[PDB]
Design a protein around this ligand. Structure first.
Ligand SMILES: O=C(O)CCCC[C@@H]1CCSS1
Length: 333
């Protein structure tokens, strides 16, 4: 059956390591949890967690362009780079973080669980603006990001309860707190959200036969999860400097553009009419698309409209419209 997991830890790197461990051990979680030893997992998961003062960048973002590191270090704010796409965001105990894991893509349904939460339990009429945002009065109150894997889909986003709104501009080189509209709390919102989650996945069953129960697991101390060598690997990587701050290597040429789906920046070198090495920074949610773009580097492409066009024809991506637009951009510079 579905799972509700909670982490009382408040370190961004620790909770991100938990999240990555759940994504990378989905079908086996029932063993890492002490529930079952044989049966393998395939049901929905909701994981709730909070983090102290932090800046989380994005798998493909440039730290130096989004963050004013001086004030971050001066104010003792932690820095991290997540595995999903999106822009740089700030975290503190005034905001909640949710992580939906599913067998198939479940974005819309997840957003429906959240909207049902706000409406039913707080009379907050909320709308979803784009693929990844929730507004209440055309003002952002939640922000999501996604990652896909063979058997797992991960939709993890942030909900704003009592976040310090003004402090943001100190670190990120409008927002609305859901307290401006209600007397909500992290515990209140969380409980309501678990309710609408279990209830959402209890439709098929008839109520008269099934218990009206809720179950909550706590994993921040589950030694099977947090004492694993894989977990420590993730934690150390996220704590590492080369990962968060990325790579400095310079590059000969650099192009850029602002697309509806986010900004794109290509750095590349060319030797003997061939695209030698390169790298892509972006603000995009479609990380798959961007890695497929990265496949252009360190391969033998003649740096010609012909060979480039061919190379784009060779790709089979999730979003073919975005790819068409991006190639139509590259062939002009
Ligand atoms: O607005 C965006 O670009 C999505 C923000 C997603 C932030 C991540 C939710 C929990 S960790 S960071």
């Amino acid at each position: 059956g579905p799972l509700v997991l909670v982490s009382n830890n408040q370190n961004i790197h620790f909770n991100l390591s938990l999240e990555n461990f759940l994504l990378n051990n989905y079908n086996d979680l029932l063993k890492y949890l002490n529930i079952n030893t044989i049966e393998k997992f395939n049901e929905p998961i909701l994981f709730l967690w909070r983090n102290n003062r932090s800046i989380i960048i994005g798998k493909n973002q440039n730290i130096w362009s989004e963050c004013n590191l001086k004030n971050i270090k001066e104010d003792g704010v932690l820095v991290a780079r997540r595995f999903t796409g999106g822009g740089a965001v700030y975290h503190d105990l005034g905001n909640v973080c949710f992580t939906f894991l599913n067998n198939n893509i479940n974005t819309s349904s997840n957003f429906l669980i959240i909207l049902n939460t706000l409406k039913n339990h707080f009379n907050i009429e909320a709308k979803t603006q784009g693929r990844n945002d929730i507004t209440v009065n055309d003002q952002k109150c939640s922000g999501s990001a996604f990652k896909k894997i063979k058997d797992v889909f991960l939709h993890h986003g942030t909900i704003l309860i009592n976040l310090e709104k003004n402090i943001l501009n100190k670190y990120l080189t409008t927002i609305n707190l859901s307290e401006i509209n209600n007397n909500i709390t992290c515990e209140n919102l969380c409980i309501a959200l678990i309710k609408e989650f279990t209830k959402f996945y209890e439709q098929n069953y008839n109520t008269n036969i099934i218990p009206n129960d809720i179950t909550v697991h706590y994993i921040d101390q589950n030694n099977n999860i947090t004492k694993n060598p894989e977990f420590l690997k993730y934690y150390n990587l996220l704590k590492d400097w080369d990962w968060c701050y990325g790579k400095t290597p310079k590059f000969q040429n650099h192009i850029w553009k602002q697309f509806t789906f986010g900004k794109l920046e290509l750095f590349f070198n060319v030797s003997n009419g061939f695209i030698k090495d390169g790298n892509i920074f972006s603000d995009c949610l479609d990380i798959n698309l961007i890695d497929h773009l990265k496949s252009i580097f360190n391969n033998d492409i003649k740096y010609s409209k012909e060979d480039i066009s061919i190379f784009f024809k060779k790709l089979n991506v999730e979003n073919k419209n975005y790819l068409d637009e991006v190639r139509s951009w590259i062939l002009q510079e």
